[PDB]
Design an enzyme around this catalytic site. Sequence first.
Site, short mmCIF file in Angstrom:
data_model
loop_
_atom_site.label_atom_id
_atom_site.label_comp_id
_atom_site.label_asym_id
_atom_site.label_seq_id
_atom_site.Cartn_x
_atom_site.Cartn_y
_atom_site.Cartn_z
CG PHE A 1 33.87 8.06 -16.48
CD1 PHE A 1 33.38 8.10 -17.79
CD2 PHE A 1 33.04 7.53 -15.48
CE1 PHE A 1 32.10 7.61 -18.11
CE2 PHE A 1 31.76 7.04 -15.78
CZ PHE A 1 31.30 7.09 -17.10
CD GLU B 1 31.51 10.04 -21.25
OE1 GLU B 1 32.69 10.05 -20.95
OE2 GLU B 1 31.11 9.59 -22.38
CG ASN C 1 52.71 18.41 -20.03
OD1 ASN C 1 53.81 18.35 -20.58
ND2 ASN C 1 52.12 17.33 -19.54
CG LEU D 1 34.20 0.55 -23.21
CD1 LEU D 1 33.72 0.69 -24.66
CD2 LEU D 1 35.72 0.75 -23.16
CG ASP E 1 33.53 5.18 -27.53
OD1 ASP E 1 34.00 4.85 -28.62
OD2 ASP E 1 34.10 4.99 -26.37
K K Z 1 29.45 9.29 -24.85
#
Ligand code: K
Length: 164
Positions: free
Chosen positions: A104, A11, A132, A32, A20
């Site tokens: 997350f 991140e 998958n 977020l 983002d």
């Molecule tokens: K990020």
Amino acid sequence: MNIFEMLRIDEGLRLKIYKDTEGYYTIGIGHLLTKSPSLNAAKSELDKAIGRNTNGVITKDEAEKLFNQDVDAAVRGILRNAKLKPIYDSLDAVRRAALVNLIFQIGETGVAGFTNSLRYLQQKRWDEAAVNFAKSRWYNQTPNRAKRIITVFRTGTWDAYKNL
Ligand SMILES: [K+]
Ligand SMILES: [Cl-]
Ligand SMILES: [Cl-]
């Protein structure tokens, strides 16, 4: 390697509100703020989060603060999810970290469509789950990151994060 370092790699760290990969307002370490297109709204969320009038910029320490909270909450919610807990419980430490990372990122709602992949994990059918997991919007929109997460689910090692 551990969940914090891992997510820290995935991140990044930004002290000022940014958007983002989905185009949403975020700050710090993938925190977020809102899915709203309004910057003010985002800034309000920030203020609520930090507990002061910031004007969109926070400190490193603050950023870490929300990140700790974030990781913890993710774990905590996985454990409160009747469908999720068994899965998590069945996994080794590394793999569990991969699961936390995924949630997350996309949230429980996000994790909701992974039923079949989760099951293959539960059955310890690594390669199959890996194949998958890849058939998803998640993989398609963040293919590099997905790929790492998937290698961890497949192998149980942090190799993919080695050298980043
Ligand atoms: K990020
Ligand atoms: Cl918060
Ligand atoms: Cl990516």
